[PDB]
Amino acid sequence: MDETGKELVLALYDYQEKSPREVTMKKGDILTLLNSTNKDWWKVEVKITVNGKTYERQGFVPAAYVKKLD
Structure with a gap:
């Protein structure tokens, strides 16, 4: 969470x-x-x-279980 303010998504399920x-x-x-x-x-x-120690990493996830914030 580096307040990038670019593309955020919220998980529904x-x-x-x-x-x-x-x-x-x-x-x-x-x-x-x-x-x-x-x-x-x-x-x-x-x-x-x-x-x-805060660590960062990107992973794949089911979009059908989440949605875009904006």
Whole structure:
């Protein structure tokens, strides 16, 4: 969450990540739309705080389970 203010998306339904490349989202979660070239698999970025260290990473998720903020 670097207040990029570019492309934000809100999750409507719950989802889980099967691979280390994907990301786990839940109904009400906010993700940073990095790549929306696809219609089924959307590439979003999330923030993971580990050991007091904020980490960034982009993963694929079901667009049908989420929506665009604007």
